Design a protein around this ligand. Structure first.
Ligand code: SF4
Lengths: 118, 57, 230, 457, 101
């Protein structure tokens, strides 16, 4: 899986200036969220050029999703149940843009009700 | 001594309607709703709600 | 010529607003992050709420677009209020612009978003600018046109379009390249800094972008305009 | 610990399991028994429309129904032959016939001042082009005491029992007590309309989000909405089993916030296209139910019709074919969602904001809002302030069956409470807005428990 | 001939433009309804001087007012005429036709 997701992230981060999310990799390589998070963790290292501002969220025990802004004093250190890089930001401002994504087979949870046309 | 107060207001202030509601709004800066006499006679009838009697009083 | 002009006007408006906001030309409090400015902006470009400034920006964009055929380079000049020295020059290079009288909105807006994002990335890294000590100007580079000579016929206007044309014709003065830059005193001469940025490359619109920075001086230049160290 | 330490503690030891994505786990099947049942009491026909009149008729109907209900309840409780501590209670009919030192009970409407808030007066004055001095017309401290009326007379009500209870004009209660020294009636015991029958009660959970307030100015709301969409798909928490228990998603209204006084169709279209993009990105993962809001482009009257078949992107044509409504259904503002055999009542919240905007000098906190909800449930009506909430009809707001769960949107505070009125258990949930303090509520149908998930930035 | 100002055109609309036409109709209807509600609230507050009540049976008294020296009454009459006009019926019919898909 390596050398492809890394290349896609590099292109989407530098060839065209646009923040990348893990959902983009779910749409691209049709892989699970855990694999995408592992890919972000792998890409966070072995990078000498710190041209991006990583965005990391915190999943608390009470499902209190919080975006880390200070990166110095995160309250309730022991209450965090999950931590991963939400997105890579080439600048301070995030302002993400959302469009139509054809999620044909990238779903991890599928509703019991199907879609019928005509 | 009896005075036609609307006539006195006409002589004193130069209004355009000389109506009690209009005169009140123009001088005392108070707006007073005006109801038709049919509304008054329908609200003053017996077996009506206390709100209507309070309104007319 | 219908959809292209609208997209170019939107891009120019976003460019001017971002340049004014990020360079502290006008107070950030007046600027507000918004998407609708009577047109569908590509992103949440901060647009100032000053009616006079809005009218001035709209008139400037319309005047630039009116002579876009003979204009191959549009630049925004940043000059110090105290002394007439150009400290920053941002250029919107219109190399070809694919001028055709004959691409949808998603691709053009995606290219505009990428260009504006690159511009923002360039702008945040720049040092802060002091308040009420900076001004902005508009300098365009043309190939074949003469401005200000249309009033020699004593023409009397009869419609709004002709009045607007005669106003735009006399609203520009002739200048020279590298005019507001320092005159190369020779005692540690300033060396301008060139930075390249990606530009929109849609099928109907081809745009290149780059910026200029003094990044040097020989005293009395960039003094009390960069908020000291930071 | 530093950010890098937490990252290498958590993300490095990723399970990387139960994420095959080839055979995704099926979401909990939650059905709406009222989706095809129709016969919606709050459904109105636009052809009939509103004639700007016919309000006293509905007032008389509501008064007669409430009087009949309270009289039946009083007969059931204060039957003939019942004697109080002082003496036998007399079933007086007219409120002016209580002349003596003897316990008695009577039925009548409650009268109060209910002064307007100064901010509401300032807002309405500036948007009338000739509005008089409303504060001057208001002018005295008003009425600090609760008075009763039954179309025959008005008497003063005193006592600590009625003092510690909010009241809105238009409702009827059964006042019991003894005549005071002056022309006032003491309050000892109170009566309410008889309780309505209630339908009988590993199931699943329903996520409630309200007050999205999508616009073209605030970008943080879009980020929070995207975070919510990612979390609802199990991408954030990664707990597939826990996330899959959310069978349906219910949007309670206020999807888009705009000022109708000065607004163009382009910005509203942009906001609606963004909402449609979110719906298309979340509809395959989970079913979404759309409800009208106060500031949304819908009827200002409380019985708001569904949004429209239009106003959404062309990618929703498959979802709007008409045959597939179980995963994307638009309902009226008041509705009874029979989720897996559990009937729940959800409203945008315009009624509560209507009573809140009034100043009652006889009774804005979470406890006060919950007490207001309790009074609304006890009065057996949804909108005590009829002129402020609804305008005419083409009365559905008079309750005919008590819902299991009460849902109200667009509230500054979130609170949950279980109550027991007339031997029936009703749960009241006040979901807060998502634009500010964007927390959502997960209602578990199996244990009737509500949990909150907070999203920051 | 025509709900909108296509020079000429059933629904009296040549170009469908459903997503824009229904949005414009909703905006106009919402503006008119909000203006009418504000006028009714102002009239109710004014009639509270006599009624001394902010609940039901006071809005009826407020609407019973027909004073010709107050612009609020004229504005309310104009709003009622606009709501009851044939144009409003035409807009509702066009909305129903466009939503019939
Ligand atoms: S019309 Fe003018 S006067 Fe009559 S009620 Fe409305 S406001 Fe008061």
């Amino acid at each position: 899986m390596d050398q492809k997701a890394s290349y896609f992230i590099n292109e989407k981060l530098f060839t065209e200036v646009k923040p990348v999310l893990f959902t983009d990799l779910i749409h691209h390589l049709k892989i699970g969220p855990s694999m995408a998070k592992k890919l972000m963790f792998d890409y966070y290292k072995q990078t000498t050029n710190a041209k991006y501002n990583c965005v990391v969220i915190c999943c608390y025990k009470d499902q209190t999703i919080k975006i880390i802004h200070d990166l110095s004093n995160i309250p309730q250190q022991d209450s965090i149940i999950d931590c991963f890089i939400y997105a890579f930001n080439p600048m301070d401002s995030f302002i993400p843009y959302y469009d139509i994504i054809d999620q044909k087979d990238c779903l991890t949870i599928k509703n019991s009700y199907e879609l019928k046309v005509s | 001594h009896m005075i036609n107060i609307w006539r006195a207001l006409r002589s004193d202030v130069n209004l355009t309607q000389y109506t009690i509601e209009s005169a009140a709004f123009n001088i005392l800066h108070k707006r007073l709703p005006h109801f038709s006499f049919e509304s008054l006679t329908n609200m003053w009838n017996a077996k009506k709600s206390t709100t209507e009697l309070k309104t007319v009083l | 010529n219908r959809w292209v002009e609208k997209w170019l006007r939107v891009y120019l408006k976003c460019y001017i607003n971002l340049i004014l906001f990020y360079r502290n030309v006008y107070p950030p409090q007046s600027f507000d992050y918004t998407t609708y400015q009577s047109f569908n902006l590509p992103q949440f470009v901060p647009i100032n709420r000053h009616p006079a400034l809005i009218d001035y920006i709209e008139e400037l964009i319309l005047d630039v677009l009116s002579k876009l055929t003979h204009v191959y380079r549009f630049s925004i000049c940043i000059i110090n209020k105290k002394n007439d020295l150009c400290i920053e020059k941002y250029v919107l290079d219109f190399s070809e612009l694919q001028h055709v009288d004959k691409i949808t909105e998603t691709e053009v807006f995606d290219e505009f978003r990428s260009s504006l994002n690159s511009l923002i990335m360039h702008l945040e890294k720049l040092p802060k600018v002091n308040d009420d000590t900076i001004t902005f100007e508009a300098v365009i580079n043309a190939i074949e046109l003469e401005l200000g000579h249309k009033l020699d016929r004593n023409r009397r206007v009869d419609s709004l379009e002709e009045k607007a044309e005669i106003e735009r014709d006399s609203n520009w003065v002739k200048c020279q390249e590298d005019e507001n830059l320092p005159d190369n005193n020779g005692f540690q001469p300033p060396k301008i800094k060139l930075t390249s940025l990606v530009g929109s490359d849609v099928g109907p619109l081809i745009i290149h972008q780059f910026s200029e920075k003094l990044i040097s001086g020989d005293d009395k230049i960039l003094n009390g305009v960069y908020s000291q160290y930071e | 610990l530093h950010m890098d330490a937490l990252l290498t503690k958590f993300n490095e030891d990723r399970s990387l399991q139960d994420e095959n994505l080839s055979q995704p786990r099926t979401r909990v099947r939650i059905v709406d028994d009222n989706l095809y049942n129709k016969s919606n009491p709050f459904q109105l026909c636009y052809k009939k429309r509103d004639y700007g009149s016919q309000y006293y008729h509905i007032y008389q109907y509501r008064l007669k129904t409430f009087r009949e209900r309270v009289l039946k309840e009083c007969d059931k409780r204060w039957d003939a032959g019942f004697t109080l501590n002082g003496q036998l209670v007399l079933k007086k009919d007219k409120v002016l016939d209580i002349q003596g030192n003897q316990p008695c009970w009577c039925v009548g409407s409650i009268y109060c001042e209910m002064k307007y808030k100064p901010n509401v007066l300032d807002e309405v004055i500036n948007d009338t082009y000739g509005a008089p001095d409303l504060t001057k017309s208001y002018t005295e401290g008003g009425s600090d005491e609760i008075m009763l009326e039954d179309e025959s007379g008005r008497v003063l009500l005193v006592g600590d029992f009625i003092r510690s209870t909010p009241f809105i004009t238009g409702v009827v209660v059964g006042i019991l007590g003894m005549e005071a020294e002056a022309g006032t009636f003491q309050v000892l015991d109170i009566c309410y309309p008889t309780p309505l029958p209630q339908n009988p009660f590993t199931r699943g959970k329903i996520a409630l989000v309200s007050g999205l307030n999508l616009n073209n100015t605030s970008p943080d709301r879009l980020l929070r909405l995207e975070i919510l969409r990612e979390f609802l798909m199990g991408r954030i928490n990664n707990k597939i089993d826990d996330i899959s228990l959310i069978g349906r998603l219910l949007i309670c209204g206020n999807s888009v916030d705009f000022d109708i006084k000065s607004v163009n169709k382009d910005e509203l279209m942009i906001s609606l296209t963004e909402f449609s993009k979110f719906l298309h990105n979340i509809l395959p993962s989970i079913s979404v139910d759309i409800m009208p809001g106060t500031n949304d482009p819908s009827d200002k009257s409380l019985p708001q019709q569904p949004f429209h078949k239009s106003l959404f992107d062309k990618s929703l044509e498959s979802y709007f074919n008409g045959s597939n409504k179980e995963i994307l259904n638009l309902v009226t503002n008041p509705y009874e969602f029979s989720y897996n055999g559990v009937d729940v009542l959800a409203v945008s919240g315009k009624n509560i904001n209507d009573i809140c905007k009034y100043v009652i000098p006889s009774n804005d906190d979470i406890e006060h809002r919950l007490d207001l909800m309790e009074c609304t449930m006890k009065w057996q009506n949804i909108a005590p302030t009829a002129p402020d909430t609804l305008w005419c009809y083409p009365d559905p707001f008079v309750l005919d069956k008590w819902p299991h769960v009460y849902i109200v949107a667009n509230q500054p505070y979130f609170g949950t409470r279980v109550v027991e009125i007339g031997g029936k258990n009703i749960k009241i949930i006040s979901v807060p807005e998502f634009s500010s303090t964007g927390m959502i509520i997960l209602l578990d149908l199996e244990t009737l428990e509500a949990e909150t998930v907070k999203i920051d930035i | 001939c025509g709900e909108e100002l296509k020079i000429c055109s059933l629904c009296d609309d040549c170009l469908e433009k459903r997503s824009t036409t229904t949005l414009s109709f909703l905006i106009k209807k919402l503006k008119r309804q909000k203006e009418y509600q504000t006028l009714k609230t102002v009239c109710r507050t004014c009639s509270y001087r006599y009624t001394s009540d902010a609940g039901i049976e006071n809005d009826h008294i407020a609407s019973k007012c027909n004073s010709y020296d107050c612009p609020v009454f004229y504005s309310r009459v104009k709003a009622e005429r606009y709501l009851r006009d044939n144009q409003s019926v035409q807009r509702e019919e066009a909305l129903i036709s466009l939503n019939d898909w």
